[PDB]
Design an enzyme around this catalytic site. Structure first.
Site, PDB file in Angstrom:
ATOM      1  N   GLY A  29       0.888  -1.050  -0.099  1.00  0.00           N
ATOM      2  CA  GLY A  29       0.088   0.055   0.084  1.00  0.00           C
ATOM      3  C   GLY A  29       0.961   1.379   0.118  1.00  0.00           C
ATOM      4  O   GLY A  29       1.979   0.979   0.451  1.00  0.00           O
ATOM      5  N   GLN A  53       2.827  10.222   1.714  1.00  0.00           N
ATOM      6  CA  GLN A  53       4.018   9.948   1.745  1.00  0.00           C
ATOM      7  C   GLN A  53       4.796  10.317   0.687  1.00  0.00           C
ATOM      8  O   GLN A  53       6.095  10.266   0.816  1.00  0.00           O
ATOM      9  CB  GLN A  53       4.122   8.198   1.649  1.00  0.00           C
ATOM     10  CG  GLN A  53       3.431   7.210   3.025  1.00  0.00           C
ATOM     11  CD  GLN A  53       3.395   6.042   2.845  1.00  0.00           C
ATOM     12  OE1 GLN A  53       2.743   5.272   2.146  1.00  0.00           O
ATOM     13  NE2 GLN A  53       4.431   5.171   3.291  1.00  0.00           N
ATOM     14  N   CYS A  81       6.690   0.248   7.422  1.00  0.00           N
ATOM     15  CA  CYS A  81       6.146   1.427   6.887  1.00  0.00           C
ATOM     16  C   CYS A  81       7.458   1.970   5.944  1.00  0.00           C
ATOM     17  O   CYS A  81       8.602   2.027   6.287  1.00  0.00           O
ATOM     18  CB  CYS A  81       5.759   2.573   7.621  1.00  0.00           C
ATOM     19  SG  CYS A  81       4.997   4.064   7.117  1.00  0.00           S
ATOM     20  N   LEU A  82       7.154   2.417   4.713  1.00  0.00           N
ATOM     21  CA  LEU A  82       8.270   2.885   3.801  1.00  0.00           C
ATOM     22  C   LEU A  82       8.713   4.316   4.485  1.00  0.00           C
ATOM     23  O   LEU A  82      10.060   4.552   3.973  1.00  0.00           O
ATOM     24  CB  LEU A  82       7.781   3.055   2.524  1.00  0.00           C
ATOM     25  CG  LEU A  82       7.374   1.900   1.599  1.00  0.00           C
ATOM     26  CD1 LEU A  82       7.037   1.996   0.087  1.00  0.00           C
ATOM     27  CD2 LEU A  82       8.686   0.796   1.675  1.00  0.00           C
ATOM     28  N   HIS A 101      -4.347   0.739   7.345  1.00  0.00           N
ATOM     29  CA  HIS A 101      -2.646   1.353   7.474  1.00  0.00           C
ATOM     30  C   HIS A 101      -2.834   2.800   6.316  1.00  0.00           C
ATOM     31  O   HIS A 101      -2.352   3.584   6.714  1.00  0.00           O
ATOM     32  CB  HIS A 101      -1.916   0.162   7.074  1.00  0.00           C
ATOM     33  CG  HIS A 101      -0.445   0.884   7.142  1.00  0.00           C
ATOM     34  ND1 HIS A 101       0.646   0.131   7.871  1.00  0.00           N
ATOM     35  CD2 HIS A 101       0.115   1.867   6.432  1.00  0.00           C
ATOM     36  CE1 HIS A 101       1.685   0.833   7.747  1.00  0.00           C
ATOM     37  NE2 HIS A 101       1.379   1.856   6.657  1.00  0.00           N
ATOM     38  N   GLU A 102      -3.330   2.449   5.271  1.00  0.00           N
ATOM     39  CA  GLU A 102      -3.159   3.510   4.208  1.00  0.00           C
ATOM     40  C   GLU A 102      -4.077   4.902   4.656  1.00  0.00           C
ATOM     41  O   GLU A 102      -3.829   6.018   4.402  1.00  0.00           O
ATOM     42  CB  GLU A 102      -3.571   3.169   2.731  1.00  0.00           C
ATOM     43  CG  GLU A 102      -2.523   1.877   2.411  1.00  0.00           C
ATOM     44  CD  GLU A 102      -1.215   2.185   2.735  1.00  0.00           C
ATOM     45  OE1 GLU A 102      -0.615   3.213   2.764  1.00  0.00           O
ATOM     46  OE2 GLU A 102      -0.452   1.144   2.942  1.00  0.00           O
ATOM     47  N   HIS A 142      -2.542   7.020   7.175  1.00  0.00           N
ATOM     48  CA  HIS A 142      -1.945   8.018   6.697  1.00  0.00           C
ATOM     49  C   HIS A 142      -2.335   9.262   6.272  1.00  0.00           C
ATOM     50  O   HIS A 142      -2.055  10.203   6.543  1.00  0.00           O
ATOM     51  CB  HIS A 142      -1.114   7.719   5.403  1.00  0.00           C
ATOM     52  CG  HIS A 142       0.136   6.727   5.777  1.00  0.00           C
ATOM     53  ND1 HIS A 142       1.151   6.965   6.480  1.00  0.00           N
ATOM     54  CD2 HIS A 142       0.326   5.346   5.476  1.00  0.00           C
ATOM     55  CE1 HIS A 142       2.148   6.197   6.597  1.00  0.00           C
ATOM     56  NE2 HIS A 142       1.827   5.185   5.928  1.00  0.00           N
TER      57      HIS A 142
HETATM   58  O1  LIG Z   1       1.720   3.069   3.601  1.00  0.00           O
HETATM   59  C1  LIG Z   1       2.341   1.940   3.189  1.00  0.00           C
HETATM   60  N1  LIG Z   1       3.780   1.690   3.197  1.00  0.00           N
HETATM   61  O2  LIG Z   1       4.235   2.333   4.366  1.00  0.00           O
HETATM   62  C2  LIG Z   1       4.164   0.544   2.544  1.00  0.00           C
HETATM   63  C3  LIG Z   1       5.298  -0.336   3.404  1.00  0.00           C
HETATM   64  N2  LIG Z   1       4.338  -1.091   4.342  1.00  0.00           N
HETATM   65  C4  LIG Z   1       3.563  -2.193   3.900  1.00  0.00           C
HETATM   66  O3  LIG Z   1       3.505  -2.237   2.673  1.00  0.00           O
HETATM   67  C5  LIG Z   1       3.013  -2.992   4.864  1.00  0.00           C
HETATM   68  C6  LIG Z   1       3.439  -3.865   5.647  1.00  0.00           C
HETATM   69  C7  LIG Z   1       2.898  -4.737   6.587  1.00  0.00           C
HETATM   70  C8  LIG Z   1       1.577  -4.186   6.717  1.00  0.00           C
HETATM   71  C9  LIG Z   1       1.056  -3.407   6.288  1.00  0.00           C
HETATM   72 CL1  LIG Z   1      -0.667  -3.264   6.708  1.00  0.00          CL
HETATM   73  C10 LIG Z   1       1.559  -2.583   5.339  1.00  0.00           C
HETATM   74 CL2  LIG Z   1       0.596  -1.313   4.627  1.00  0.00          CL
HETATM   75 NI    NI Z   2       3.031   3.376   5.506  1.00  0.00          NI
END
Ligand SMILES: O=CN(O)CCNC(=O)c1cccc(Cl)c1Cl
Ligand code: NI
Length: 194
Positions: A71, A76, A121-122, A164-165, A168
């Site tokens: 996601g 971001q 999270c990135l 999660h998104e 943000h």
């Molecule tokens: O906002 C998005 N990111 O930061 C991308 C990096 N994290 C992921 O892909 C990710 C990893 C684990 C659980 C969830 Cl729920 C997510 Cl979303």
């Molecule tokens: Ni994230």
């Protein structure tokens, strides 16, 4: 601006476009988009989805120096708009593929859930262990690029990722939802996934 730079035909989103903790944009509440969408807002969603696909490809991820993601939210990219992309692989090829404009949770379960392996999270260049406590099930409204409204029900991984998104675009980070005292506490009504 970030959006003008990112939506150039030639531009490929990479890690240098992704802002990190400390940048106030991640702690700001993003602005709703209006309809009809601008060409730029449509292209942005498409670029975001392309990024996720690149990040999930062995060869492209290697070449571009990408961390994998399922996601991404516009904040971001330092773009304070309520736009998210979600790309959750099935174990078609995808459990969920969606570019969402103004997504909103309109119902959620009493039951909570959390990935057993925690989250990353990135925008967070460090590991933060613990159960990220979320709603098990959500009903989400959103608009697609044509301003058509969708209402979907999500569970399991898809539910976690979309929450999660959405977090943000509300200035919320995944560790905001980890139990400080006991990161791996298992409350009543908490479903641990995996
Ligand atoms: O906002 C998005 N990111 O930061 C991308 C990096 N994290 C992921 O892909 C990710 C990893 C684990 C659980 C969830 Cl729920 C997510 Cl979303
Ligand atoms: Ni994230």
């Amino acid at each position: 601006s970030a959006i003008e730079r990112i939506t150039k035909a030639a531009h490929l989103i990479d890690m240098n476009d992704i802002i990190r903790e400390g940048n106030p944009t991640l702690r700001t509440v993003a602005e709703e988009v209006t309809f009809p969408l601008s060409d730029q807002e449509i292209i942005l969603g498409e670029k975001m989805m392309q990024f996720l696909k690149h990040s999930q490809d062995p060869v492209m991820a290697e070449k571009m120096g990408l961390r994998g993601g399922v996601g991404l939210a516009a904040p971001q990219l330092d773009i304070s708009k309520r736009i998210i992309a979600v790309l959750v692989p099935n174990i078609e090829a995808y459990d969920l593929e969606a570019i969402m404009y103004n997504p909103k949770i309109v119902s959620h379960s009493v039951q909570d859930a959390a990935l057993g392996e925690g989250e990353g999270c990135l925008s967070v260049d460090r590991n933060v262990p613990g159960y990220v406590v979320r709603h098990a099930r959500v009903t989400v409204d959103y608009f697609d690029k044509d301003g058509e409204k969708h209402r979907i029900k999500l569970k399991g991984y898809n539910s976690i990722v979309v929450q999660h998104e959405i977090d943000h675009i509300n200035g919320i980070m995944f560790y905001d939802r980890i139990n400080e005292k006991d990161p791996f506490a298992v409350k009543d009504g908490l479903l641990i996934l995996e």
